[PDB]
Chains A and B, each alone.
Chain A
């Protein structure tokens, strides 16, 4: 009996999910281990980038034995083209990593000192792109009908927050209408 939530995912569970996405790293180190699902790696070379899963990068970052790379889409100069492209298409939600909120929480807790110009900038940027996008969702949510919605490109977290609401009142709405014919 899962109790909470239960129909929607838990906010934590979507991080539990996203940490399964691989991203590049800069190992300080120069057994085996096969583990199960990793496939990697031959002993990591210091000052050499390589591709590994996230939860291990985070794990090896707590010990500061590795320096995570910043994603090419996580930058303020990069985000600028994205909010510019977002203000100008009030309908569509543009192009999203789909994890961007949760990576934006996770990579800022520890890895923060690795980013170039992380301070007081990107958080200001993504807290914004997580603003106009949210209100655009609430103003795109007036057009609700059964059964269709284009939620286009939308974050996993954004999906998870509003899920019970939409997929509940769709189940009050479509419920009268299917049944009245």
Chain B
């Protein structure tokens, strides 16, 4: 999840309806369960992301057919297919999980 600005659980998990609704209730209840952990910290977290440590600390992201610009948080990165942003690890973590960024 998914990740900035989560901001809702949607379009994820290609299994969707094919997987049993009994599990999906558990699932939605579970991400609802983790929203509270998100709400205790005050880290900030971003717990969902950054399993792999920052270096260093600016990277280069090459657009991958994404539109864009949807980068509202922090700044309007103005997403544009065939455009690489010499941007800090910060918004890279959040945006790479979605599927916009490609090369770290």
Q: Do any beta carbons of A and B sit within 8 angstroms of each other in the complex? A: yes
- B contacts with A, residue count (CB < 8 A): 4
Specify the chain B residue showing the minimal Cβ separation from A10. B52
A13 at the A/B interface (Cβ < 8 Å)? Answer: yes
Report the number of A-B residue pairs with Cβ-Cβ less than 8 Å: 11
Are A2 and B53 within 8 A (Cβ)? no
A16 at the A/B interface (Cβ < 8 Å)? Answer: yes
Interface of A is mostly: helix
B25 at the A/B interface (Cβ < 8 Å)? Answer: no
Interface of B is mostly: loop
Interface size class of A (residues with CB under 8 A): 10 to 19
Are B51 and A2 within 8 A (Cβ)? yes
Alpha-carbon distance A12/B52, docked complex (angstroms): 8
Are B56 and A62 within 8 A (Cβ)? yes
B35 to chain A, nearest CB (A): 16
Are A58 and B53 within 8 A (Cβ)? no
Are B53 and A12 within 8 A (Cβ)? yes
Specify the chain B residue showing the minimal Cβ separation from A13. B53
Alpha-carbon distance A33/B31, docked complex (angstroms): 39
B contact set with A: CB distance below 8 Å: 51-53, 56
A contact set with B: CB distance below 8 Å: 2-3, 10, 12-13, 16, 55, 58-59, 62
